[PDB]
Design a binder for this molecule. Structure first.
Ligand SMILES: CCCCCCCC(=O)SCCNC(=O)CCNC(=O)[C@H](O)C(C)(C)COP(=O)(O)OP(=O)(O)OC[C@H]1O[C@@H](n2cnc3c(N)ncnc32)[C@H](O)[C@@H]1OP(=O)(O)O
Length: 323
């Protein structure tokens, strides 16, 4: 198959053509793609904390090379595009486009199949690096979270955070307790660790935050001694000082953000670019009228009140020195 046939068959937009050309030139992987199927797939999906409903649906719809040749072509090459950058934190997180849901469950769960096909490769990388098994598995369990989020957000099964899962699948992100850390470099090449906060695992209790920070240097200095980061960086809705108007002192976000040194300029008050981030993480927002959104927590109320007052939320960037 040629990439135009694939684009057309899958319903992908014209601006994906360059990506499909790139994948065409890359070609199939040296090790052919194997999807686990049946109970093997159920066992793997359960280990990845994929909810039972979604897992049953993923196994049932697992695509076939003969019956799904366009989708299969894309699966093979997308897998290859990830594994060619195993351990490479300088490569951009290009997981490929989402497939139109007119392709059914196979299209909806396309990037779950990518993930499942790439588990063996990343687990081999974990092993080569001396990563403890419990750490490697705990890292990959964010698949289950992301699957659960899609259903909460859109009402059916899926997983459309494939750009994010390229980090996990390239062996460049590790969950070390409550927080995740990624190998990263600044514009001047200086190593840092990118810090992120998965949804699952409960509130960001100061003791859980502090413990994760204490694990970072030891972990990366042992398994990735070539990196040698001394600071963690973050870009988040959570680092917006405007939250202090609305959240009390007992807020975990307020308490933890006080340790951070913000490095970006105070944003323009009219800049609305950060609104979508906070709406995603607080509401899994999907274009609904704002007065329909829940108001059970102080943050939910705060996000809506601030927007209703004609004001805007901003993602801010900063750092903390690693213990
Ligand atoms: C510390 C800086 C790190 C910066 C780099 C991070 C880069 C990123 O990863 S950006 C993405 C961040 N991740 C997320 O947003 C994941 C989804 N969010 C969450 O799960 C939570 O917001 C979480 C766990 C981070 C923090 O929760 P928690 O510890 O409860 O926050 P806290 O500040 O104590 O909450 C204050 C109030 O807001 C509520 N609240 C907090 N988060 C949320 C949320 N996402 N949705 C709805 N309500 C919320 C709390 O329930 C609490 O309610 P009340 O005052 O009514 O009792």
């Amino acid at each position: 198959m040629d990439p135009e046939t694939v684009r057309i068959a899958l319903g992908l937009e014209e601006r994906t053509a360059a990506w499909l050309t790139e994948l065409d030139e890359l070609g199939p992987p040296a090790e052919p793609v194997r999807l686990p199927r049946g109970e093997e797939a159920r066992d793997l999906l359960r280990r990845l904390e994929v909810p039972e409903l979604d897992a049953e649906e993923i196994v049932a719809a697992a695509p076939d090379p003969d019956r799904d040749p366009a989708l299969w072509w894309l699966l093979e090459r997308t897998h290859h595009a990830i594994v060619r950058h195993m351990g490479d934190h300088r490569a951009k997180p290009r997981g490929g486009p989402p497939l139109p849901y007119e392709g059914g469950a196979a299209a909806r769960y396309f990037h779950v199949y990518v993930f499942l096909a790439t588990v063996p490769a990343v687990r081999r990388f974990h092993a080569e690096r001396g990563i403890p098994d419990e750490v490697g598995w705990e890292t990959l369990t964010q698949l289950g979270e992301l699957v659960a989020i899609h259903r909460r957000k859109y009402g059916q099964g899926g997983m459309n955070m494939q750009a994010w899962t390229t980090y996990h699948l390239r062996g460049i992100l590790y969950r070390l307790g409550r927080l995740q850390f990624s190998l990263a470099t600044g514009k001047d090449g200086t190593p840092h660790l990118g810090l992120a906060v998965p949804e699952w695992g409960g509130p960001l209790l100061p003791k859980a935050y502090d413990e994760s920070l204490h694990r970072a240097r030891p972990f990366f200095d042992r398994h990735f001694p070539e990196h040698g980061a001394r600071v963690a960086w973050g870009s988040s809705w959570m680092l917006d000082p405007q939250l202090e108007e609305y959240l009390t002192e007992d807020s975990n976000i307020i308490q933890l953000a006080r340790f951070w040194t913000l490095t970006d300029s105070a944003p323009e008050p009219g800049n609305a670019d950060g609104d979508s981030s906070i709406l995603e993480f607080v509401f899994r927002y999907n274009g609904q009228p704002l007065d329909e959104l829940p108001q059970r927590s102080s943050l939910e109320r705060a996000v809506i009140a601030h927007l209703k007052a004609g004001r805007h939320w901003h993602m801010r960037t900063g750092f903390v020195k690693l213990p």
